[PDB]
């Protein structure tokens, strides 16, 4: 019996109850980024950069 | 019996009840970034940079 | 018995109940990116960069 990195539970979401009673919702983007309404999200990156709800307006690396 | 890094529980979300009764919601982005409404999010990055709700207006690395 | 990286549970979502009673929803994008309404999403990247709800306005790497 070793259990090397075993029996784990990593990047987990459970038992999530959500109610969203919105009468009006409105997003207006003019250039750039808009991230809206991320719910119950699970990730596990290995040897990499992992974002979830990142937003960047605009990367301008001219020349 | 070793249990090296085992039996763990890392980056976990559970038992989340949420109610959002909003009559009006409005996002207006003009250039740049807007991140709105991240709920019950779990991540586990290894050997990497992990953001969740990052927002950057604009990276301008000219030349 | 070794259990090297075994018996795991990584990047998992379960037991998610959601109700979204919205009377009106409206997204207006003019150039750029809009990400809206990601729910119950699970990922596991290995040796790579894994985003989930990323948004970038525009990459302009002229010359």
């Amino acid at each position: 019996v070793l259990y090397v990195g075993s029996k784990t539970k990593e990047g987990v979401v459970h038992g999530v109850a959500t109610v969203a009673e919105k009468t009006k919702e409105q997003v207006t983007n003019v250039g750039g980024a808009v991230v809206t309404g991320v719910t119950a999200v699970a990730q596990k990156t290995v040897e990499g950069a992992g974002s979830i709800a990142a937003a960047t307006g605009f990367v301008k690396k001219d020349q | 019996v070793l249990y090296v890094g085992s039996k763990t529980k890392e980056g976990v979300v559970h038992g989340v009840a949420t109610v959002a009764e909003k009559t009006k919601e409005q996002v207006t982005n003009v250039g740049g970034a807007v991140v709105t409404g991240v709920t019950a999010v779990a991540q586990k990055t290894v050997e990497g940079a992990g953001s969740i709700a990052a927002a950057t207006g604009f990276v301008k690395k000219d030349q | 018995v070794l259990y090297v990286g075994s018996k795991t549970k990584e990047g998992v979502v379960h037991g998610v109940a959601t109700v979204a009673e919205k009377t009106k929803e409206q997204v207006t994008n003019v150039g750029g990116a809009v990400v809206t309404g990601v729910t119950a999403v699970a990922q596991k990247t290995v040796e790579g960069a894994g985003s989930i709800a990323a948004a970038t306005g525009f990459v302009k790497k002229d010359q």
Binding site: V30, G31, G32, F58, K60 | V30, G31, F58 | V30, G31, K60
Partner: peptide, 10 residues
């Protein structure tokens, strides 16, 4: 020459 004008004249 990034420009992101926007108006909401009602």
């Amino acid at each position: 020459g990034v420009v992101a004008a926007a108006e909401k004249t009602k």
